[PDB]
C-alpha cells in the first residue's frame with residue numbers, strides 16, 4: 001500500500017515504483033536476466049560433485065584459473081596514465097550503494113573446515129600451488145543465502161540486501177532500524193551521528209560499530225580501534241573506502257547546517273531528508289556525468305546510456321544477479337599499496353606505501369595515522385593500475401586478501417569465479433549472446449575476440465570451451481573499449497544496468513517534480529573536487545575530471561577557483 | 574540481523590551502539606530539552622527498552638562501558 005503524495009524516498013526503496021512497489025526495495029531477490037545454470041538444474045553449483053562436468057567438460061578449479069591466467073609479476077604493474085586511484089575507489093563506493101549479497105555466519109564451520117557440506121563451498125587447491133603447499137587445504141567460501149530458503153520445488157536465487165537505486169544508501173542505510181542508528185537524535189538539526197571519542201583535526205569521523213569479534217581490532221590489537229558504522233556494513237574494509245564514507249557523512253552535515261540557516265523553522269526530519277536528497281543527487285551526477293563515461297568509453301556510453309527522456313515505470317530497476325559479478329571488474333584497477341601524501345603532495349612518513357594486505361579492516365590507520373586527508377590525496381594523485389591481458393589482478397588481493405583477520409589469505413579473483421558458480425550464472429558465451437555479440441566456439445575464434453591468441457590458449461586449457469568461461473574472467477579478459485576501461489561484454493552488462501537504474505528511478509534528479517528548475521541548475525555545478533574542499537583541510541585538488549587527473553602538480557588547482565553549490569533555491573517562501 | 578561476508582561478521586543489528594548509550598544522558602537530565610527527551614523515550618520504547626535501567630543493562634550485556642550509570 002503506497003501513498004499518492006510523497007516527497008522523499010523511503011529508506012528501503014519500497015514504493016519507488018508505484019504499480020510495482022517492491023522493485024528496487026531491499027532484501028528481495030536479484031532479477032535474472034538469464035536463467036540460472038546449476039549442476040543439478042536448480043541449486044547445486046557447477047563444481048560441486050567431483051567428476052560431474054559442465055557441457056561435457058571438466059569444471060576448472062577457480063584457484064587454478066587464478067593461478068594460470070590472473071597471476072602476474074608485481075614487478076611489472078602498469079600505471080594507467082589516464083585514471084586516478086579515485087576512479088577505482090568511486091567504483092567500490094558505488095557498488096556498495098547498489099548491491100550486497102548476504103551469506104551465513106560461522107554442523108561444520110566453513111571458516112575452519114574443508115568439508116564440502118551446505119553452506120560451505122570451499123575452493124579446492126590445484127597441484128603445485130605457488131602458495132598453499134598442503135593440497136588438502138582450501139580457501140573458505142560461504143554460499144550466498146537463498147532467497148526462498150529450504151525449498152527444492154524452486155530454482156535457487158540470491159538476495160540483495162540493499163536498495164538498487166543510486167540513492168546514497170551506503171550513507172543512510174537500507175533498512176529503517178540502521179537508518180535511525182545513523183542519525184543524530186540528540187537534537188532537531190537533521191544530522192548524521194559522528195564519532196564521540198575521536199576527531200580528525202577537529203572534523204567528524206564515523207561512529208564506531210559494536211561487534212563481538214570485531215575484525216578491525218585484530219589488525220592492530222594494541223591500538224584497540226573498532227570498525228566504523230556507515231550506511232553499508234563494509235565501510236571499514238579498507239581505509240580508502242572509509243575515507244569516502246567519512247567524506248559524504250561530513251557533506252551531509254555541512255548541507256543540513258546551511259539549510260537550517262536558510263530555513264530556521266525547518267524541523268530535524270525535513271533537514272535530514274533535504275540534505276539526504278542532495279547527497280543522493282550528487283552521487284547520481286558524479287556517477288553518470290563523470291564516472292560511467294570513463295568506464296564505458298564514448299561508443300558504449302551512447303549506445304547503452306542514451307540521453308535521459310523521463311521516468312518510465314515499466315523499467316525494472318532491480319540489480320541483475322550477473323551485475324554483482326560483472327561490476328567486480330574494478331579489482332583489475334587495484335594498486336598493491338595505499339598511498340598517503342602530505343599537504344605538499346609528497347610521501348607521508350614513516351610509511352607512505354602500506355601493502356594492501358595490512359590495511360584491510362585497519363580503521364586504526366584513519367584514527368591514529370593522520371585522518372582522511374593523506375588518503376584522499378593519495379587517491380587523487382596516484383594512478384590506478386591498468387588492466388592488461390597478462391597483468392589482470394595483483395597478488396595483494398590474489399594471495400593475501402584479509403590475511404590479518406583470517407586463518408588463510410583469500411584469493412579475490414578465485415572467489416569471483418566461485419561466486420558466479422554459487423549464483424548459477426551462465427558462462428561467457430551465453431552472456432555474449434544476451435548482449436548480441438559473436439559467440440566464439442574454437443580457440444582461433446576466441447583469440448580473435450580477444451586479439452590475443454596467447455590468452456585464448458590459456459582459457460581453452462583451463463575451461464575446455466568458451467561456453468564454460470566464468471563471466472568475470474571472460475569479461476575482464478576482453479580488450480578495452482577506446483577511452484574506456486572494460487571490453488564490450490561488460491560494457492553491455494554495466495551500461496544496461498545503469499540505464500535501468502536511471503530510467504526506472506522515480507526520484508532520479510532530472511525527473512520532473514523531484515527538484516525545481518532552479519535546484520537542477522545549481523546541482524549541475526557540484527563536483528567531487530569541490531566536495532573534498534568543503535569537508536577537509538585540502539586546499540589543492542584534482543581538476544575535472546577527478547577520475548582522469550592523476551599527477552601533481554600538472555592536474556591540480558587551488559580550491560578557491562571552484563564555485564560552491566549555491567543553496568539559495570532551497571530557501572522556503 | 575547478523576550480516577557477514579567471507580566469514581567476517583560486519584554488523585549485528587541486535588547489539589547496542591556506543592553513541593546511543595549517550596542518549597541516556599538526556600533521559601536522566603532533569604533540565605533536558607523536554608521535546609528531545611520525549612523523542613528518545615519513544616525511540617527506546619520502540620526497541621523494547623522501556624526503562625533507563627533496561628537500556629543500561631543491555632549496553633553492559635553488549636560489551637559497552639556502563640560506568641557513569643552506577
Ligand code: HEM
Pocket residue numbers: 088089091092095099100101102237238323324325327328329330331334412415416419578579
Ligand atoms: C579495497 C578493494 C576491494 C576489496 C578489498 C574488495 C573486496 C571484495 C570482497 C571481499 C568481495 C566479496 C567476495 C566474494 O564474493 O566472496 C567483493 C565483492 C564485490 N566487489 Fe570488491 N573489493 C574491492 C574493490 C572493489 C572495486 C574497486 C569494485 C568496483 C566496482 C568492487 C566491486 C565489487 C562488487 C560489485 C562486489 C559484489 C558485491 C555483493 O555482495 O553483491 N570491489 N569485493
Ligand SMILES: [Ca+2]
Pocket residue numbers: 097098162163164165166167168169170
Ligand atoms: Ca542504493
Ligand SMILES: [Cl-]
Pocket residue numbers: 031032033034320321322323
Ligand atoms: Cl542475471
